[PDB]
């Protein structure tokens, strides 16, 4: 349908707070569409507010993308032809643009106070809650000269065109704002500082962005942006207006956007719990898109191959922790055991949940639990019984399994285990089955539950015999002996 589009897309977050999963969804959609089409992914930091902005947040945005495996073609660290890529560094570019806009009559200096606007609404019998009145379009040279001579500091406003402001949204379809409905808008504050309304569309133009893919909560900015892009083409600064694609807002439990105050929106809360990049990328891909109607499990290469903005839906995109957890668990199970073992060791070690097993033993234990967890952190509760200072016999398990009958099972197993020549899972198994099954004719649940509770503290544990092997003879014997009291 048919030539591949020529694509330059951006991810343009503000460095305020922690990396919001809606915003990371938007990064991924941009990245996937670039990679699908052989296009360029531009990373721009929109840091024009010193009050809210922080270097901690900047570094965390870089870390978020790198951890997720989403590399950028132009942006911080890497550079590129249209830099610098932090807006805090492009002050001189914005001043030039403003100057050019002002000299073409695309933009003008405006001196009204909000109170003078309100008073003009009242005299004309207009709703005084309405906005800017375009009064300053029509200032005489003398009146303009006269405001400056009084020390008025103007703002720069853009002169809106007279026609409709409309585009065909790649996700939302046709959108139109009527001729005259949008007041001439401020591109600066009275200090001269440029506002989002200048810097965002200006850098999209200057960085030659072809497709703007962003959350649909920003849709209302688009007409103002269209106006500015048009002005920038007239003054020879840009060439083409980008296409726009507005992505479904990521919701929490109701109709409301998932909040930045809500810990579920924090990418790194998921990290800390033990999401892996492959899990979380798969999940975030499902927040407005879908590889197939018959399955939702996929990797990044599969997404790159399949992803087109034409297939983004505008249906409600609700964040569902259960689904995210389920996909993470599938992705965990897809890892090669060596990869998984290294990731799991590092996760536990770096969250002060060291497991008291040597490297090869821990690998063996990791192998045993790869199919039992939804997130890496869950392995602590499953494996901490290897740590003598964490082991505790659950009192309900004890009451049920460590009665006189179970006590009797331990007596037999303990004598069984002394005959085990080498302390390995098969010989442990054989000794205990010889004694408890072949010998005492016990039902397996009856033969083994007391030994599992004794050795692990609980009625559910990793494979019992393997677990006994890794605990070692001395520890296993000690626990079994104590369990009978
Ligand atoms: Cl969102």
CA 466 – ligand 1 centroid, Å: 46
Helices 359-369/464-471 angle, 10° precision: 160
CA 215 – ligand 1 centroid, Å: 5
CA 283 – ligand 1 centroid, Å: 14
SS3 per-residue string spanning the chain: CCCCCCCEEEECCCCCCCCEHHHHHHHHHHHHHHHHHCCEEEECECCCCCCCCCHHHHHHHHHHHHHHCCCCCEECCCECCCCCCEHHHCHHHHHHHHHHHHHHCCEEEECCCHHHHHHHHHHCCCCCCCCCCCHHHHCCHHHHHHHHHCCCCCEEEECCCCCCEEEEECCCEEEEECCCCCCCCECECCCCCECHHHHHHHHHHHCCCCEEEEEHHHHHHHHHHHHHHHHHHHCCCCCCCCEEEEECCEECCCCCECCCCCHHHEHHHHHHHCCCHHHHHHHHHCCCCCCCCCCCCCCHHHHHHHCCHHHCCCCCEECCHHHHHHHHHHHHHHCCHHHHHHHHHHHHHHCCCCCCCCHHHHHHHHHHHCCCCCCHHHHHHHHHHHCCCCCCCCHHHHHHHCCHHHHHHHHHHHHHHHCCCCCCHHHHHHHHHHHHHHHCCCCHHHHHHHHHHHHHCCCCCCCHHHHHHHHCHHHHHHHHHHHCC
Q: Is 31 left (phi over 0), alpha (psi -120 to 50) or beta?
A: alpha
Tokens of 460: 């559910």
CATH class of 252-335: mainly alpha
CA distance 130 to 106: 23
Structure-determination approach? X-ray
CA 11 – ligand 1 centroid, Å: 13
CA 216 – ligand 1 centroid, Å: 7
CB-side neighbour CA atoms (13 Å) of 384: 15
CA distance 281 to 28: 8
Residue 373 phi/psi, 5° resolution?
A: -125, 150
- Residue 322, annotated as binding a ligand: no
CA distance 434 to 440: 9
Tokens of 232: 């920038």
* Protein fold of 336-387: Helicase, Ruva Protein; domain 3 (1.10.8)
Q: Is 288 left (phi over 0), alpha (psi -120 to 50) or beta?
A: left
Instruction: Measure Cα distances from 206 to 85, 127, 230 in Å.
Output: 11, 38, 13
Q: Tell me the chain's radius of gyration from C-alpha atoms.
A: 32
CA 421 – ligand 1 centroid, Å: 62
> Domains of the chain: which residue ranges?
1-75+196-251, 76-195, 252-335, 336-387, 388-485
Tokens of 327: 């996909």
Task: Tokens 């109170």: give the residue.
Answer: 115
CB-side neighbour CA atoms (13 Å) of 146: 5
Architecture of the domain delimited by 76-195: Alpha-Beta Complex (3.90)
* Protein fold of 1-75+196-251: Rossmann fold (3.40.50)
- Contact at 8 Å (CB) between 34 and 7? yes
CA 252 – ligand 1 centroid, Å: 10
Listed residue (278, 366, 380) closest to 329, CA to CA: 278
Q: Does this chain's domain 336-387 share its CATH topology with 388-485?
A: no
Active site residue 260: yes
CATH number, domain 388-485, options 3.40.50.10420, 1.10.10.350, 3.90.850.10, 1.10.8.640: 1.10.10.350
CA distance 436 to 232: 85
How many CB atoms are closer than 10 A to CB 379?
Answer: 24
CA distance 332 to 316: 28
Question: Annotated catalytic residue: which of 243, 260, 323, 446?
Answer: 260
Listed residue (174, 204, 169, 200) closest to 187, CA to CA: 200
CA distance 477 to 485: 14
CA 238 – ligand 1 centroid, Å: 29
């Amino acid at each position: 349908m048919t030539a591949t589009e020529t694509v330059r897309v951006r991810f343009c977050p503000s460095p305020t707070g922690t990396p919001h999963v809606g915003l990371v969804r938007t990064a991924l959609f941009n990245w996937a569409y670039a990679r699908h089409t052989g296009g360029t992914f531009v990373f721009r930091i929109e840091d024009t507010d010193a009050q809210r902005d922080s270097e901690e947040s900047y570094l965390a945005l870089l870390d978020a993308l790198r951890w997720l495996g989403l590399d950028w073609d132009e942006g911080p660290e890497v550079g590129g032809p249209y830099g610098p890529y932090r807006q805090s560094q492009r002050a001189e570019i914005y001043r030039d643009v403003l100057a050019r806009l002002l000299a073409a009559g695309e933009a003008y200096h405006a001196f009204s106070t909000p109170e003078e606007v309100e008073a003009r609404h009242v005299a004309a019998g207009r709703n005084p809650k309405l906005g800017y009145d375009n009064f300053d379009r029509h200032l005489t040279d003398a009146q303009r000269a006269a405001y400056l001579a009084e020390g008025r500091q103007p703002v720069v406003r853009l002169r809106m065109p007279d026609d409709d402001l409309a585009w065909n949204d790649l996700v939302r379809g046709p959108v139109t704002f009527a001729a005259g409905s949008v007041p001439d808008f401020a591109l600066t504050r009275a200090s001269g500082d440029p506002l989002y309304t200048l810097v965002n569309p200006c850098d999209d133009a200057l960085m030659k962005i072809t497709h703007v893919l962003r959350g649909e909560d920003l849709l209302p900015s688009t007409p103002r942006q269209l106006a500015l892009h048009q002005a920038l083409i007239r003054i020879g600064v840009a060439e083409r207006i980008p296409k726009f694609a507005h992505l479904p807002t990521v919701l929490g439990e109701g109709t409301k956007k998932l909040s930045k105050r809500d810990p579920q929106s924090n990418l790194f809360a998921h990290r800390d719990r033990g999401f892996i990049p492959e899990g979380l990328l798969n999940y975030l891909a499902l927040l407005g898109w879908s590889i197939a109607d018959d399955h939702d499990l996929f990797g990044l290469d599969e997404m790159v191959a399949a992803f087109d903005v034409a297939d983004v839906n505008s249906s409600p995109a609700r964040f569902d922790q259960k689904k995210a957890d389920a996909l993470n668990a599938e992705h965990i199970r897809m890892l090669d055991v060596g990869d998984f073992t290294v990731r799991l060791r590092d996760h536990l070690d770096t969250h002060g949940h060291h497991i008291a097993l040597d490297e090869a033993a821990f690998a063996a234990a990791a192998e045993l639990v790869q199919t039992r967890i939804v997130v890496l952190g869950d392995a602590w509760e499953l494996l901490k019984f290897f740590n003598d200072d964490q082991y505790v016999i659950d009192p309900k398990a004890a009451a049920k399994e460590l009665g006189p009958d179970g006590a009797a099972v331990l007596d037999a197993a303990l004598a069984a285990l002394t005959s085990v020549t080498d302390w390995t899972a098969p010989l442990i198994e054989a000794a205990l089955k010889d004694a408890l099954i072949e010998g005492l004719a016990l039902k397996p649940r009856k033969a083994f539950s007391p030994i599992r509770v004794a050795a692990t503290g609980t009625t559910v544990s990793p494979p019992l015999f393997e677990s006994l092997e890794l605990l070692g003879r001395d520890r296993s014997m000690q626990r079994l002996r104590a369990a009978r009291q």
